[model samples]
Target: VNSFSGYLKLTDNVYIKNADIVEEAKKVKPTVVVNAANVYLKHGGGVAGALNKATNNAMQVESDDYIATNGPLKVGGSCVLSGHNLAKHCLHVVGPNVNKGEDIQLLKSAYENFNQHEVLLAPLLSAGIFGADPIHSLRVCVDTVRTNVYLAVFDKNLYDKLVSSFL
Candidate 1:
């Protein structure tokens, strides 16, 4: 994993990385892991897709259970799952559509919704297949989340740029 640790204006507990989130989570040992999912709780693409595979599809099963009871998820809403293969718990968030002009705010809402955890791991929400800007999403993550946050990436150039920007 090619990664570095640094701080933004408000906190020094943020980590930036170009690596697998699950692998990084094993090293960071966050109290909870946040997964970016759609309203249907389908972990079939983007960060959620990778996470579902990493956790041996346990996340999918958990998400299914939630939907079974609660129906479809709401934008910016979340459901927690325990017994993860890596982190102690997983917080699945329904991210908003980037084309809807509410991506940033909804992303912030998701972060705020789960910001109470002592340690949290998350990807750049709405930044990948969801079509939101990575840098902007990251800025929101750093600005809104109060506790320790690990922002996982898979692009080395992006990671370097983010690290340099912080420095």
Candidate 2:
């Protein structure tokens, strides 16, 4: 009821895959990994932590530098996180922690703020611990994300739902 195997290319470039973000990022070496980040820009956990695992925690180090340079970002703000190990670069955005009208606006802004990248790898922004509903996150992602975006879904249920959303 909640699992989907195989990768599906929803459009010429947009994709829905039941894959690990880090794994896919490696395959697409120059891929930009987008993180639904906190205001502090700390690579603490979740997608941030997973990608930060190796590479001597350089993600955290770059983020600390980013914050020092720019100060704490407000919700919906986005910045370029430097390439560390596996990922080529990270586009960090502060997504809303609540699911509300305001949250949707910010999330949409965050996605829209994304400029063109060769290949964009992203988690389900704000859908997990950040608190945006899965359905909302999917719709916003599919609707707002530009082409050439690869959505890496870690949860089976979410994966199936994403496939259903595209198909």
Candidate 3:
């Protein structure tokens, strides 16, 4: 695994890794693992889908119920679910649908709200299917959280790019 670290006022610890997110999740044993999802919590593809499968769809059920009662989440909104097989909890954030830059703001909002957790495992939110630049998304992630943040990358090319840019 390739890893790097840094510090920000809101973020006590920051880790960027080129490894399987689920495996990283296991290693870190984060208090919460994040899922990048849409307003509706639709988990058909991307990291959100993978997280849903990994947790045996427990997150989706919780998300659906939340949406049913509270309506669709706003761009920066998030919901917490009981973790089934990995972390103690799951944090599902509503990512941007149009502007990629907006994703960074939304990510910051999510992290600000959930930063109480001791450790958090998350992806480069909005960089994949949401079409945000990976580097920018990661910068925002590193800047926002007040606790330990484990950012996982599955693609080697993206991993190398990030390492060269930040580490």
Candidate 4:
């Protein structure tokens, strides 16, 4: 569970790993980590929750205060928050919910929102509970991002699937 199950190099910098992203991030100490968040920026479950827990709940508090002052984050847009013990910054992006008939364009835009040249450790947007296909999401991550990426595949099934498809 701590080791990468598989690996693939996409570009010179972008790569994919069937890894426990949080553990890898702790080791790699990337400049930023991505949280597949909702518009409300609640870190209740999924990647968001795990990040919040890892940072001793500071991320959730900061996120709440940020939303309390600002407004709900727009889809495909991102907010930079504290990663505390994790990455220097956490990028929270709201992916389109497919069950609600949301388009893939928004999800593409979400990946594009990184807007930095640093090492990024991220998960696939909308590919989990939001219902986007994992392989398609992987392709989008490979296609849209500009900076160095360590694409974390947390789910074992999805990880094997991605490796089978691309490895």
> Whose lDDT is greatest here?
4
Q: Give the per-residue Cα lDDT of candidate 1 at 17.
A: 62
- Which candidate number would show the highest TM-score if scored against the true structure? 4
Global lDDT of each candidate: 0.74, 0.74, 0.72, 0.81
CA shift at 8, candidate 1, in angstroms? Answer: 9.7
Sorting all predicted structures by TM-score, with the top scorer first, yields 4, 2, 1, 3
* Tens digits of lDDT, candidate 1, 17-56: 6777767766766667778778888888767887788879
Against the true structure, what is every candidate's RMSD? 3.6, 4.6, 4.3, 3.3
| Candidate 3 lDDT over residue span 56-161, tens digit each | 8877787788779988877877877776677788787776654645645666675575576767777877778888788887777777766777777889898888
Clashing pairs in 3: 10-145, 10-146
Q: What local lDDT score does residue 138 receive in model 1, on the 0 to 100 scale?
A: 76
Q: Give the TM-score (vs. native) of candidate 2.
A: 0.85
Candidate 2 lDDT at 1 equals 19
Q: Give TM-scores for every candidate, taking all chains together and pairing residue i with residue i.
A: 0.83, 0.85, 0.81, 0.89
Model 4 lDDT, full chain set: 0.81
